[PDB]
Ligand binder design. Structure first.
Ligand code: 2Y1
Ligand code: 2Y1
Ligand code: UDP
Ligand code: UDP
Lengths: 227, 231
């Protein structure tokens, strides 16, 4: 009954700006934020999330498996809980996930394996881990907030985490092409077949929508009407 | 309907041997060997296990978190596969688990932590994941019982050489004494304060297996059978 839509995009591309605006326009809409975004700050998960992230910055090749695995759990935990304990007696139910378990694996984990930050056994253990848990949160559509690396880079400054001032354009750039293929070009191979058929919607967020978000919202309601 | 009984011991207790002995004595009686033993011998799980098992040996403070999470994840899946594809239509089906999710954590992973092969953050993550893989997926796995095969750490080392796996040949001693200690701390004194409420209610057949039992096991099985009727 509840619709499940993933908001997807690059770092600082506006996913969080979009979801904060969407939550407020309808009684019947709620968002599940990125737990990785909360770790950039505190309870068990917050400290654990705190440390693993920082360790990742110093030495990705040592910490990527651990962080990719714990990120995904934290997200799966956090989404499941919204289903089974929210949008409780609203009429036209929609949940907006900030990124997904397909992001975790097929953008993020993948990229780390391609940067040799995960060795083969870690990558293959992570996929088996990910494959088995899944078929036991499944999406009704995906919204792609599409931005260039340059836009994202500035935005990283705008909010001003220091580790991202660090984050370089070449890192943005490869995260950027991994989105086009799954989502825009539609040709990244994946182990979850229905996501070749999952309805997708793409929005340009280069322009500052902070004070001009009706054109985007209109396309979102439009999008939801066909599902 | 299928009762689940964990065989817990230290390394080279004779578990594999004994579960294998029990398994031939009844058609109501099936076994789930431990994923790790299998790796210590193929599938994508073996291929992964042999690799991470081999690295675990080679640099344990890099690979302990990885190893533990995969070994436990893999146990759950075997115990599920068995507890779906075995023993329907048995009048009194019994499933004997070669080790359990609880030895994965409170004995091996805990030990790896305490021996500094995992930092706090890894051990806190593991523990979080553990509660959660078990809650979400591992509900059908609560144990009706545990059979503790208790041998002395020395009996155990004596036993390690005979099995004679190349990789295992260099396993130290003081390890065993720490494991036994946790195995005794866990399965005799019950000082170990599990987070799993129901482990305090599950009874424990403690069996002394310091005497060789491979051709002379009838009293061992008799004890199981009376324990089994008490469940
Ligand atoms: C955003 C802050 C968390 C970090 S830190 C990080 C990173 C840090 C330092 C790095 O090199 C020294 C690095 O690249 C190593 C090889 F590229 C990645 N990537 C990331 C994410 C892009 S990985 C990630 N995985 C997820 N599953 C989810 C998510 N939101 N982010
Ligand atoms: C015997 C093959 C599996 C291995 S390899 C291993 C190990 C080997 C060498 C080590 O130091 C060089 C080592 O570090 C011990 C530090 F306390 C562990 N421990 C073990 C187990 C005791 S860890 C384990 N955890 C499980 N959950 C299951 C299982 N069968 N084994
Ligand atoms: O239309 C926008 C979208 C974002 N931002 C700013 O860009 C930064 C990063 O955006 P966000 O936190 O949404 O990034 P994401 O959630 O995509 O990582 C934040 O400081 C926002 O306030 C902005 O000024 N205008
Ligand atoms: O009563 C016994 C118990 C064990 N063993 C031998 O000791 C080693 C330990 O066996 P096992 O692999 O069954 O122990 P586990 O590690 O599975 O607890 C094996 O070579 C067995 O053949 C034996 O000869 N008599």
């Amino acid at each position: 009954r509840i619709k499940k839509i993933s908001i997807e995009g690059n770092i600082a591309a506006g996913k969080s700006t979009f979801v904060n605006i969407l939550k407020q326009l309808s009684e019947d809409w709620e968002v599940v934020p990125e737990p990785v975004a909360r770790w950039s700050n505190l309870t068990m998960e917050q400290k654990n999330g705190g440390n693993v992230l920082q360790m990742m910055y110093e030495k990705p090749e040592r910490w990527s498996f651990t962080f990719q695995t714990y990120a995904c759990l934290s997200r799966i935990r956090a989404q499941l809980a919204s289903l089974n304990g929210k949008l409780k007696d609203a009429e036209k139910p929609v949940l907006f996930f900030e990124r997904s378990v397909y992001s975790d694996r097929y953008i993020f984990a993948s990229n780390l394996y391609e940067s040799e930050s995960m060795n083969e056994t870690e990558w293959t253990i992570y996929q088996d881990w990910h494959d088995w848990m899944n078929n036991q949160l499944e999406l009704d559509g995906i919204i792609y907030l599409q931005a260039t690396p340059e836009t994202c880079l500035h935005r990283i400054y705008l909010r001003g985490r220091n580790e991202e001032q660090g984050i370089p354009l070449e890192y943005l750039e490869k995260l950027h092409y991994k989105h086009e293929s799954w989502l825009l070009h539609r040709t990244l191979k994946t182990n979850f077949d229905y996501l070749q058929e999952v309805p997708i919607l793409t929005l340009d967020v280069n322009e500052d929508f902070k004070d001009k978000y009706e054109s985007l919202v209109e396309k979102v309601k439009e999008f939801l009407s066909t599902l």
